[PDB]
Structure formats: C-alpha cells, structure tokens
C-alpha cells in the first residue's frame, strides 16, 4: 500500500505545516502537525477541557462506530517549547491520504497547555519518531507509521515541505519526479528514539565550506534550524546589524537585510537553504526588526534540522531494518 497527503502551512511565516487525517467511522477529519521529532498521534476531542478548546476542530470519539477505549491507559507529554498536553487513549481507524491504519493508538487530550489553544489551526500532533519516545502508560503505543510500515510497498515515508506554498508527506514510495539530481543517504541513530544524523559542514552565503560534523535530528515539528553557537555566530556575522537578543530569546536582524544561504553538508552532498527561507518577519507587529531562522541550540541539548532545513530539501525517512535517512535538493 501507499498513502499521499497535502501539508500546508499554517500561516505567512511556516511556521507549521498540517495535513488532514481521517479518523473514526464515519471519518472525522482533523488536521495534524506531522512531527518527526516526537512520537504520539494526539488530538484535541470531545474530552478536552472546553476552556482551552478554541476554534479548533475535535475528535469525538463517542460518534466512531469503531473507536475502542484503550481501557487504562493514559499519557502526557511536554514539548521543548515547554507546551504540554495529556489525556486518555482509544484505538480507531486511522487514515492519511489514502493509506489506513485500524487499531491505531489515538491519544484524546484532556488538557492541553496555552500555546496549543491559542493555535486554532492545529488540531493535534501525529508523532514519526520511533515508538520508543511514545508516552502511553502503562502499555506503550506504536506510532502511524510503525504500524503501516508492513503493509507499505517499500518502509518509508518522505517530507517534501514547501516555503511558503503547500507540499507532500508520501508513505511507502518515493516519488523520483519530486526532486533533483540523487538522494544522498545517511546513517541514523536510533539511540534517544529521533531521526539523528551527523551533517558533514556547512557554508555561509558563497563563502568556504567548513567540514565539521554535526550530530543533529531530523524534526519536522520544529519550526527553525537549530545549530551549534559557532555556526550560528559564523552565519550571522554576515548580515550587518544582525545580534543576539536576549530579551527577544535570539538572533534578530534589521528587516531590511538581504539573508545569505546557508548550506548544510550531507554526506559530500550539499543542501542549499535559500536566504529569504530564513526569514521568520517581524519580532512584533509593525516592528523593524526580524527574528532569525537560525538559532543556536546551546539551550536545547541537541541540534535540530527543523522545516527552515528540510523544506529545502527532499527527505526520505527510510524505516527498514537498519534505518537511515535521505537528502535530495528539489
Ligand atoms: O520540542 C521540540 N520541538 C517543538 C515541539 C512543539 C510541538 C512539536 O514539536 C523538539 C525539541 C528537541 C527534541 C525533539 C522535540
């Protein structure tokens, strides 16, 4: 089998990107924020706390003729951003695109933190890490895609994010129109449960390749491209003006610069992130100065190619047995 889903930007920024998932009988669709970062299908419901429901549509499961309460069990978890959410769990059919999933863990959310709220756009998360990171307690759940991984026709799924314009999550095949030149593969390490890679360098603007590895994850559910402070440093020294702002919490630049590329190294292939996708606008309304879509990840514990990364790319996210992960330039 194979799926294929449109994902969208939720706003000007891309600052996320959601798809439409199906869920329940008769389908019930909500639109997910694809997260290769982390590893539970959640989704704002019918049990969720109507004070922090606002705008966004709900599963419910009660009107799901296959929908069966996962009887037990329950999960919680918190996101690097510090947002949260936690609740109960039934199991349903599940569909993206095309390609279903019965008995799919689906994590209904009693509670969930401000931030989630406040994004009416975002109905809930379906986690692609490894079912390793998954929080069901006290039996743990398998992601979407572990659970489709069987059936698919080859056990993949690829990211083709767009900027500012919409993309394409595909499961079970790689679509050899969808991008340019080869697919460079490389290693992955399963060991915290993400999709970690080690980048082989980088470069600013038309300047030097610096060869250097950086041992980072492949996140989808992460907005910016989270480097190492001398990286970071070496980027921005390149637009005048540009400084770490404390109060802001990073990097801003003067809005009437003109952004370099930065180019990421993947094996001795090499990815090119164009300047203006670095580019996140104004820090408030009406305001001169810019945040930056590279920030340091000093604060963070690991470095994360988040979608300013792979909406610059093609990428396979190869589940076989020895999992690896693939860049081609689009
Ligand atoms: O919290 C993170 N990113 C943002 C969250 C927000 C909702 C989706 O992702 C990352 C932090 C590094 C480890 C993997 C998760």
């Not at 799924?157 to 129109?177: E, R, V, W």
């Not at 991008?179 to 390490?189: D, F, L, Q, R």
């Not at 910016?224 to 402070?229: D, G, I, K, Q």
């Amino acid at each position: 089998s194979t799926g294929s889903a449109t994902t969208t930007p939720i706003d000007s920024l891309d600052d996320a990107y959601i798809t439409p998932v199906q869920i329940g009988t008769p389908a019930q669709t909500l639109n997910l924020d694809f997260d290769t970062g982390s590893s539970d299908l959640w989704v704002f419901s019918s049990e969720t706390t109507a004070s922090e429901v606002d705008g966004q549509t709900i599963y419910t499961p009660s009107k799901s003729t296959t929908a069966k309460l996962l009887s037990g069990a329950t999960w919680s978890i918190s996101y690097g951003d510090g947002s949260s959410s936690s609740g109960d769990v039934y199991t349903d059919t599940v569909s993206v695109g095309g390609l279903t999933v019965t008995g799919q863990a689906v994590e209904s959310a009693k509670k969930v933190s401000s931030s989630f709220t406040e994004d009416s756009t975002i109905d809930g998360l379906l986690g692609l890490a490894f079912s390793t990171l998954n929080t069901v307690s006290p039996t743990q759940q398998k992601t979407f895609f572990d659970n489709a991984k069987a059936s698919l026709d080859s056990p993949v799924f690829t990211a083709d994010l767009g900027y500012h314009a919409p993309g394409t999550y595909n499961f079970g095949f790689i679509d050899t129109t969808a991008y340019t030149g080869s697919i460079t593969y490389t290693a992955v390490s399963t060991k915290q449960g993400f999709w970690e890679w080690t980048s082989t360098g980088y470069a600013v603007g038309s300047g030097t390749f610096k060869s250097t590895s950086i041992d980072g994850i492949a996140d989808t559910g992460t907005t910016l491209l989270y480097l190492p402070a001398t990286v970071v440093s070496a980027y921005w020294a390149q637009v005048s003006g540009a400084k770490s702002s404390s109060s802001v919490g990073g990097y801003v630049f003067p809005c009437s610069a003109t952004l370099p590329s930065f180019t990421f190294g993947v094996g001795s292939a090499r990815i090119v992130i164009p300047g203006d996708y670095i580019d996140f606008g104004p820090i408030s309304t009406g305001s001169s100065s810019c945040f930056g879509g590279i920030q340091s990840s000093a604060g963070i514990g690991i470095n994360i190619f988040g979608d300013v990364a792979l909406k610059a790319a093609f990428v396979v996210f190869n589940g076989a047995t020895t999992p690896t992960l693939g860049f081609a330039s689009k």
